[PDB]
Amino acid sequence: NAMTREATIRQILVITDGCSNIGPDPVEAARRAHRHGIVVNVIGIVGRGDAGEQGYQEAHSIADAGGGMCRIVQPADISATAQMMTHQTMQMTLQQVVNQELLAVMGKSTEDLPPADRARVMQVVEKLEDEVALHLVVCLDTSASMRDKIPTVREAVRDLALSLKVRSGPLAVSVIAFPGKGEEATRLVQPFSSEVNVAALEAELVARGGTPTGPAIDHAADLLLSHARNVD
Ligand code: NA
């Protein structure tokens, strides 16, 4: 139906091992993204040692400003965590969409409905969670300290895409790395596709440089907005 076609979900998932240390503020980038309805989620990775570089205040602020979630996890748990966050934030966004439609058709929010009707509406939301298009840009930190986390991250991203493909609705996933090749700020690893290109992840995820999280988020939002226009 129309409301399913209109309720396309747009998310940026940042996977990182510490706060930005070069370039402009990613909190502002996420705030910009969210004005377009994009939700920005952040996974911070627990590494080892004295954790000197692993500061996640910024990660929390990015998720707050981007209307999403922040979780901090060991490498073994990145895959499961990414899947949970993507589904839980998609569910929250769609609940809001349905509530707004209810108000337009009727003056009632889901809270104003009796239990039986609230249950019917939640079934509508579950259906939307399966059937809407999902546009996702995964932004992968490839600063020097990421070197030993990268192999796990490559597998996690592959697994995320595979798990999302189970849904009825279309999947469009793009991947970017930050920082970029040579002196560039980001690298497009793959354009939007229904699958993750594993050879491309292996070739393009090189751990070097600092972390320019701000430009990564801006690039991701740009990709989502360009894709929306292409789909139109
Ligand atoms: Na880092």
SS3 for 230? helix
What is the spatial distance between Cα 103 and Cα 2, in angstroms, rounded to a whole number?
17
Q: How far is the CA of 139 from the centre of ligand 1 (A)?
A: 13
Classify residue 218 by its DSSP letter.
H
Q: How far is the CA of 128 from the centre of ligand 1 (A)?
A: 36
Question: Nearest CA to 36 among 64, 67, 15, 70?
Answer: 67
Tally of domains within the chain: 1
| Contact between 220 and 139 (Cβ < 8 Å) | yes
What is the spatial distance between Cα 135 and Cα 171, in angstroms, rounded to a whole number?
6
What is the spatial distance between Cα 229 and Cα 232, in angstroms, rounded to a whole number?
5
What is the spatial distance between Cα 182 and Cα 161, in angstroms, rounded to a whole number?
28
93: CB partners within 8 A, 6+ apart: 9, 39
Q: How far is the CA of 37 from the centre of ligand 1 (A)?
A: 28
CB neighbour burial string for 74-87, b if at least 16 within 10 angstroms, e if fewer:
ebebbbebbbebbe
| Contact between 87 and 126 (Cβ < 8 Å) | no
Residue 3, domain CATH: 3.40.50.410
| Contact between 63 and 98 (Cβ < 8 Å) | no
Q: How far is the CA of 18 from the centre of ligand 1 (A)?
A: 5
Omega before 114 within 30 of 0, i.e. cis = no
Q: How far is the CA of 150 from the centre of ligand 1 (A)?
A: 11
What is the spatial distance between Cα 146 and Cα 207, in angstroms, rounded to a whole number?
6
Question: Nearest CA to 36 among 228, 178, 185, 214?
Answer: 228
Q: How far is the CA of 175 from the centre of ligand 1 (A)?
A: 18
Q: The sheet that has 187-193: what strands, in order across it?
A: 70-73, 39-45, 9-16, 134-141, 171-178, 187-193
| Contact between 11 and 38 (Cβ < 8 Å) | yes
Q: How far is the CA of 209 from the centre of ligand 1 (A)?
A: 9
Range of the domain at 114: 1-232
Q: How far is the CA of 110 from the centre of ligand 1 (A)?
A: 43
Q: How far is the CA of 54 from the centre of ligand 1 (A)?
A: 7
- Per DSSP, the residues of 194-215 read SS--HHHHHHH----S---HHH
